[PDB]
Every structure is written in structure tokens, then in C-alpha cells.
């Protein structure tokens, strides 16, 4: 779910199992630096690929000129009855025609998808 | 979605079906509006061109 790097030579960390204490042991095999990982996860792959695109969308896309501009469907944190709607248009990441609403206020940026 | 079809594919198929039905209906109305003396009708009922 996440990776980190070595400390004193600053290299990439590889897994290792421990023969005695039976705990997974991430280690740099360019070194002898051994430590445990609290995540206890090494590999995950969402093959159907239902990632959350709410973190994917830049908060500054709303201030685009050539994007659409609706008047209904107001924002949540602020009222601001004006918003922009568009689609993801990302290849290989699903086929949904469902719309991605972003608030267009200069200091807002709470985006929602209904 | 239509079974066996992509959601974009079935959306495009529905839009194409609606616009083709519209063009068929408007062509039928235009053909019914033609007079007997209309030469455009005569050229295509004769089959010359």
C-alpha cells in the first residue's frame, strides 16, 4: 500500500522474511539495515480499478474558461450557486458517463460527484 | 447498458438511432410534400439519376 527507502545509503527497500521471530522485515540488501513495517501489506492491485477520482481532480480546474458552467447544483461547504461539470475522460479507467462537479469559487474547491 | 455493448457504445447507438429516425421522418415529410410537377421527384421516380 506504500513504500519507503533506505536511510544511511538512501536506496530502495526490498522485503525479507525473518527465520526466528516470524515477522516481515523490509531491508536494503545494499546494506544491513533491517526494520519492521506496521502496515503489514506488501502488494495490492485493483484490477477492476475502482480508484477514487476525487483526489485525482485538480482543485483549480474550475477556473478554466472553456469548461461548461451550470447554474444549479450548488456546492456543499459554501452555497455559491455556480459550478462546473465535466467527465473524467481517462482511457482504460471504466466507461462511466457520470459527471464530476467542482465548485468555482476562488477559495473553495470542495468537489463532489453525484 | 445494452448487453454485450460498452456504455459509450450503447449511448452512441441510441443517439445514432434517434437521429436516423429523425432523418427518415424528415425525408418522408419532404417526399410527401413534393408536387407532381416537381422535377426533383421526377428524376428519382424515373430512376435516371
Amino acid at each position: 500500500v506504500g513504500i519507503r527507502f533506505c536511510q544511511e545509503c538512501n536506496n530502495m527497500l526490498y522485503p525479507k522474511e525473518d527465520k526466528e521471530n516470524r515477522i516481515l522485515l523490509y531491508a536494503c540488501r545494499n546494506c544491513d539495515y533491517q526494520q519492521e513495517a506496521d502496515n503489514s501489506c506488501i502488494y495490492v492491485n485493483k484490477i477492476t480499478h475502482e480508484v477514487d477520482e476525487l483526489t485525482q481532480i485538480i482543485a483549480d480546474v474550475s477556473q478554466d474558461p472553456t469548461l461548461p458552467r451550470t447554474e444549479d447544483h450548488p456546492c456543499q461547504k459554501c452555497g455559491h450557486k455556480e459550478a462546473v461539470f465535466f467527465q473524467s475522460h481517462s482511457a482504460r479507467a471504466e466507461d462511466a458517463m457520470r459527471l464530476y462537479y467542482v465548485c468555482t469559487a476562488p477559495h473553495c474547491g470542495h468537489r463532489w460527484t453525484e | 447498458p445494452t448487453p454485450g455493448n460498452t456504455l459509450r457504445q450503447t449511448f452512441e447507438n441510441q443517439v445514432n438511432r434517434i437521429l436516423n429516425d429523425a432523418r427518415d421522418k424528415t425525408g418522408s415529410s419532404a417526399q410527401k410534400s413534393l408536387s407532381e410537377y416537381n422535377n426533383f421527384k421526377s428524376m428519382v421516380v424515373s430512376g435516371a439519376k
Binding site: 536511510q7 545509503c9 536506496n11 526490498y14 525479507k16 540488501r29 545494499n30 546494506c31 | -
Partner: protein
């Protein structure tokens, strides 16, 4: 208090020339460098070319500590000028232009694979077995 409306007014001074040339470091924060380790330092020349237009070298604590190699920035300071403001008891800021900016990166201290024996594990282009124990043979 006084810090809620604190106003500080200091004097900027530029001397014309200094007998000792000044420059600037470049360390990444992701390197996680400490200054308590800085007990003995070396800064010498590279010998790979064999001097002013040649990349740099630095040593920490001899061979025990980590190693850096310095390279000069590619851009020219024809339209840029960088100043260093130093605090002094007289209270007047000093403005000193830097000469060059050098970039430094850490180096590993281990049995790196030499090039004359690097060709034997290229026949195992895809046939390579046990990536995790290549260092064990060395």
C-alpha cells in the same frame, strides 16, 4: 505584546570586494542529513578527469562517513544574482553575491559491481534467477 506589532529596521551594506570567495551548498531534505556528525570534513578535487571548471569532491570523517560529489549548475548567472544575509552584532545586514552554485548527491560505500565482471550476468537477460541474492555472491 511587543511582538504583535513588532517593527524591525536594519541597514543593508555591500562592501566592494572580499579576499575570500563565497559560495553555497545544495542538500536535499529527503536525504535526512544531520550536522552533529560533522566532526571532521574534507573537500578536495576529483581525479577522474586527470581544475576550476571540473566537478567537485567532498569527504566526511575520512572513509567512515558518507561521501558527496559536487557538480556545478548548468545555468549561467548572467541574469541572476544571489545574496546571503548574515546576522552580526552591529545589526546591519551584509549583502554578498555568490560565485557559483554546486549540486551534491550522496554516494554508497559498498562492493559495487565492476564493469569487467558486469558482462557475465547479461547472458541471463531474462533467465536471471534470485534477484534478492546477487550481492551474496559478491
Amino acid at each position: 505584546g511587543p511582538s504583535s506589532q513588532n517593527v524591525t529596521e536594519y541597514v543593508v551594506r555591500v562592501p566592494k570586494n572580499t579576499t575570500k570567495k563565497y559560495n553555497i551548498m545544495a542538500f536535499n531534505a529527503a536525504d535526512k542529513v544531520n550536522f552533529a556528525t560533522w566532526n571532521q570534513a574534507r573537500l578536495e578535487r576529483d581525479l577522474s578527469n586527470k581544475p576550476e571548471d571540473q566537478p567537485w569532491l567532498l569527504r566526511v570523517n575520512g572513509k567512515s562517513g558518507r561521501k558527496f560529489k559536487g557538480i556545478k549548475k548548468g545555468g549561467v548567472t548572467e541574469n541572476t544574482s544571489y545574496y546571503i544575509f548574515t546576522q552580526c552584532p552591529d545589526g546591519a545586514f551584509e549583502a554578498f553575491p555568490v560565485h557559483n552554485w554546486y549540486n551534491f548527491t550522496p554516494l554508497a560505500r559498498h562492493r559495487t559491481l565492476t564493469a569487467e565482471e558486469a558482462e557475465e550476468e547479461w547472458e541471463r537477460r531474462n533467465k536471471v534467477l534470485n534477484h534478492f541474492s546477487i550481492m551474496q555472491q559478491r
